[PDB]
Amino acid sequence: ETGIIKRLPHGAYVELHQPLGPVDEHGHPIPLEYAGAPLPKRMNKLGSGGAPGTGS
Amino acid sequence: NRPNMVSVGTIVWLSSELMFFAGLFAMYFTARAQAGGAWPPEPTELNLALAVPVTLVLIASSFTCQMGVFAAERGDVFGLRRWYVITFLMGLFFVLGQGYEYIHLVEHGTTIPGSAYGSVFYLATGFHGLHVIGGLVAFVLLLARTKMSKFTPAQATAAIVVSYYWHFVDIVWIALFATIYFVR
Amino acid sequence: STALTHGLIGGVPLVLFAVLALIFLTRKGPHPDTYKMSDPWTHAPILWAAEEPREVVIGGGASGKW
Amino acid sequence: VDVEDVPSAEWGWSHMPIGVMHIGGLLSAAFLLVMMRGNHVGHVEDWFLIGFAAVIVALVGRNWWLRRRGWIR
Amino acid sequence: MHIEARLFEILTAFFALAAVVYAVLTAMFATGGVEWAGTTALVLTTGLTLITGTFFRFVARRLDTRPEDYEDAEISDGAGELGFFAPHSWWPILISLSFSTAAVGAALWLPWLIAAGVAFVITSVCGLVFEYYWGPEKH
Amino acid sequence: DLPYGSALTSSGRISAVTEPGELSVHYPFPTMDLVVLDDALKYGSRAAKARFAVYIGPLGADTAATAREILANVPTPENAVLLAVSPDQRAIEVVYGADVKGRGIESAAPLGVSAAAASFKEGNLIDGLISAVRVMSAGVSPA
Amino acid sequence: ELEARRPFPERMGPKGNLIYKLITTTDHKLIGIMYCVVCFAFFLVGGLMALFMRTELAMPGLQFLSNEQFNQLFTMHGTVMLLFYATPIVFGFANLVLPLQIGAPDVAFPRLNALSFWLFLFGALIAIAGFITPGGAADFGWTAYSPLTDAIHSPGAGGDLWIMGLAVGGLGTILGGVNMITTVVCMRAPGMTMFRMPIFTWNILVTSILVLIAFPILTAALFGLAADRHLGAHIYDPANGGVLLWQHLFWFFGHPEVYIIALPFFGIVSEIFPVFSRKPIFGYTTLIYATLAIAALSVAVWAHHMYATGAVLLPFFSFMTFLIAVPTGIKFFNWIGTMWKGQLTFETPMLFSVGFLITFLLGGLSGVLLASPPLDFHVTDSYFVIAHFHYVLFGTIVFATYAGIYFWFPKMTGRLLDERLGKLHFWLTFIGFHTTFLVQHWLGDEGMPRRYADYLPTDGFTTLNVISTVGAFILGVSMLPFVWNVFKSWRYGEPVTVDDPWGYGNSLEWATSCPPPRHNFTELPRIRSERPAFELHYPHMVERMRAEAHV
Ligand code: HEA
Ligand code: HEA
Ligand SMILES: CCCCCCCCCCCCCC(=O)O[C@H](COC(=O)CCCCCCCCCCC)COP(=O)(O)O
Ligand SMILES: CCCCCCCCCCCCC
Ligand SMILES: CCCCCCCCCCCCC
Ligand SMILES: [Ca+2]
Ligand SMILES: [Cu+2]
Ligand SMILES: [Mg+2]
């Protein structure tokens, strides 16, 4: 869950999701199988925040 | 095209924070009306040779804080950091200056249990000093966030709302400084 | 007195609770009456299916009559 | 247990027998009741022991009755 | 958003009138002169509505009519991303626990517990502020 | 064609209303009996990994060809087992998809027919459905 | 057209469906539910305190309580009801429907919203934790008059925990008020103008403004009291003028605080009356002006609680206090006008709202009696005062609270509470409340002061005290049917498959499923008035409402 809320033209409120794997033709991600490893829950931990800028 | 939600939330809270200082102001005025003619009474001797330079430093910190806002609105994270570091240093100097005033006032017999004037003076100025310390913490926390991710508009919003609190703190001190050191 | 005071405090709320419960809890609720076999099935057709497992060639079936 | 109740049922110990928790709860309440035997002269603590033991017994009985009738599994 | 500050300006005028009237009415034919506690509260109560109203007045005249400020806007006019809203966070309960620890220390006057509470609050507040800004681990 | 107080929304959903003090479901069965059947359906399907369905209404004149059409409405009909009951027709039609073939439904489906019929003679509709679902689900393997 | 359904909806979620959500949720719907359960637990806790006092006051002489314990009881009983039940449940109803009412997907600050709940839960626990200390909890009354609260006169740690517990909870209330102002200003749906919002949304926004004025000054006063008790300061020293200094600040907080828990419940019945009358709210525009006038007037009438001190300007506060009765009277005429020439069915949400009108009026009529200093000179600090704020709080924070609970339970749960059990609960509550509080008008007038642990057999107060004790225990047993209804109807209640279980809802929450999805809306309708859901469900009535709107 990226935390970004979007209003559809007909008034629907949906939250943008970041898939961790392949997606469908409709856009919904393919469900993944648990592998005993921790799963990301924050977009900033996936590198969405970028870097401030090289320098002092 | 829309109002800044964080700015509205900060301004709304800043207005409520003023009522907290209203209670402290009421205590000072209530004790002043019961002074009987001596306000401040002996042996309290306020000196403006230190309060005035300390007050001027806090006022000058607002200008450099505003300069950081201009850099933040310009997208220059490095300009924002330079001005906010300078603002933090002068804000720290204000705390040290107030504490140095506190030490000499205590040595001369002006303390919280010592007199009614000491109670209102230290509560009013001390709680403001706590607000200054909280503002210095906000500067450090915001500047630490500047090294974590790229300079985004939401990050620039956080810089602006922090300056709102700093401007509120500076304006409150001017009311406190004029009411205590001039309207005796 | 003292026995009357404790009797009213402990007795009236329980008596009032029983009287008011008999008035209201004995009434018929909005729930429909259980269907009876002797009566015709006048209700709309009902299709019930389980949600598990979470998400047309037939493989066979059977007949029956009671 | 099924994966519908405990998603990681096949990854570790995920089931504890209900008899262990039921008998443990009954022994839990019994130990609270036997602690009224002592040198203490007050009875405020005794009523606290009685209340906690009664609550534990009521919870155990409710769980057992609901599992017996089949409302919970 | 012209209605929102008109609400605060209306409150501002009444609070200013009450603060002025109370101060004058307590200055005359009232024992002890001006009653400072109520006068100070009323004067700065006007300040609360004045700051919020003035800010809303400046924001309103900058931006044009919003879809929720239109008298005949369509639902499709609001299409687009609204903003960032946190999906989940256990930091808020830690902040309250940190603040409650300091309050208990202040209630019983335990300076060590107060110091621990203040340190806990700072760490808890830092976690909330940095929660959605921490980068990936670097190894 | 929509009922009173019902509207078609911009997303295609139907926004319906009910009069105050009235019910939106109103099945002619006790609430607790419905819970038992739902538990039998939910846990019976879980134990066999096949969606169990129950139908109560008419079945045309040749019940067997109506059940067949009805099973197309069940989600994942290929892995579904439907029990159709027609009080007015006094019959019991049971249909299952191709994915259930060879998993033991052939032995269990007549047993579910017999279990439902026995309780129906006593005037118990919900009890008959519960009994039929339980025996059929116990005889179907998750294979 | 055969659509598969379950025979019954799922009773409860699987194992682990709630515990991690409770400590990590940012959803206002779950948080609002979390505010109702905890506030209803505190209401039960505080009610037990009143039962202990009321049992003790049944007979002359101290049968089982001491003077100290009784003094601790009404202090904590009042603190729990006013600050731990009434004030938070204002934000309890706010998180339930206000984002739905304005067509918003979430509150402005979801994490700050969650912080308020925990600040409020741990702050309340700190103050209540005084009862486990050997000395006991606070015993100086919820007013905490000075210098009775000074360390000389209140040296125990129970008072200190009371001060610090209030400060923590007050911070959460301030943050909640900040959240609600921002949410109304910035999260409105397209086409939802300021003068199209529901009255409940208007009441909450105006109430949140009152919070920002009242609660910070209370926090400032409490910190000054803490300085006196721990640092030996002279803030509230009588020689320094601190007797009236504490009273002025505390009542500048307190009287705006009782409309923080009045106006939102005025909005709740304002939502319920149009639905069950099949008519639009009467004087929608004027009700907003009445609410604004009530909020503005409540800030400058604080000293009518200090008539007997002989240190306040009587004509100023007496006149402005009389002015408040005018907008409050306007609200009655709008509520009656809404019910006038309608089609009333009197369901449980409507039945509780009607009880509010009957109960609130008598307490209100006692208010104008108290607003005159000459009459207050005899009835202040007596049980007549106790009768005023009990008739006038009970109507708002109990009758309207129960009306809102019954009204919005299908919306937030998808299940309907039993009406037969609800009618029993309402009548038990009504009869018990009136029985226990009607005779207290006579007791205060006869000469029985408030906050007395004991009286004498020759005082002539025994008969009326016994009658009040009988009624109070009816209020205690009135609690069981509602708790049973909530416990049973939350898993086995009648399923709700429609958007509006009450048929004629007007606000936007009735235009979505029961319960609403995570983001509250899968679509939004065209907003053209203050009844968007009624227009959506009854398009043919759109022409009629515009034509018949004016008499
Ligand atoms: C604000 C809301 C509110 C509510 C709802 C109430 C509720 C009640 N109060 Fe009030 N009260 C105040 C607000 C309120 N109170 C305030 C502000 C004061 C000021 C005190 C002061 O001076 O400081 C006050 C003080 C006060 C007095 C004055 C006492 C004195 O001065 O000596 C009295 C007199 O009887 C009273 C009685 C009652 C009774 C009988 C109820 C009935 O509601 C109680 C019945 C309700 C119950 C909930 C019973 C509980 C039943 C159970 C079955 C509980 C079981 C629970 C467990 C076992 C965990 N309270
Ligand atoms: C829900 C909370 C609540 C509300 C809404 C009110 C509303 C009012 N209250 Fe107050 N009050 C309290 C809570 C509340 N109060 C509490 C808790 C205390 C004591 C605190 C303590 O000591 O612990 C208190 C005490 C208190 C005092 C001090 C008593 C004393 O201690 O001596 C006074 C005196 O002025 C007062 C007056 C009023 C008036 C005039 C209103 C008005 O708002 C009511 C007006 C309503 C009507 C008048 C009915 C509608 C009008 C009409 C239909 C038109 C009729 C017109 C006329 C009759 C002219 N109340
Ligand atoms: C207290 C130090 C004051 C120093 C004077 C100058 C003021 C500006 C300092 C800027 C620091 C930048 C650090 C940074 O970017 O690190 C960032 C991380 O910092 C932190 O997480 C903690 C920062 C310190 C927390 C402060 C808590 C207590 C505050 C006390 C206030 C008195 C960089 O993270 P990164 O690994 O690069 O993503
Ligand atoms: C539901 C109305 C209850 C009314 C209770 C008041 C009764 C007063 C009786 C007084 C008797 C004096 C001897
Ligand atoms: C607005 C004032 C209401 C007064 C109600 C009085 C109740 C009747 C008590 C009768 C006692 C007779 C001894
Ligand atoms: Ca007695
Ligand atoms: Cu008042
Ligand atoms: Mg008095």
UniProtKB/Swiss-Prot annotation, chain F:
Domain of life: Bacteria
Name recorded for this polypeptide: Uncharacterized protein MSMEG_4692/MSMEI_4575
Keywords linked to the UniProt accession: Isopeptide bond, Ubl conjugation
Disulfide bonding pattern of the chain: none
InterPro entries cross-referenced by the UniProt entry: DUF5130 (IPR033437)
Positions bearing the Isoglutamyl lysine isopeptide (Lys-Gln) (interchain with Q-Cter in protein Pup) cross-link: K101
Organism from which the protein derives: Mycolicibacterium smegmatis (strain ATCC 700084 / mc(2)155) (Mycobacterium smegmatis)
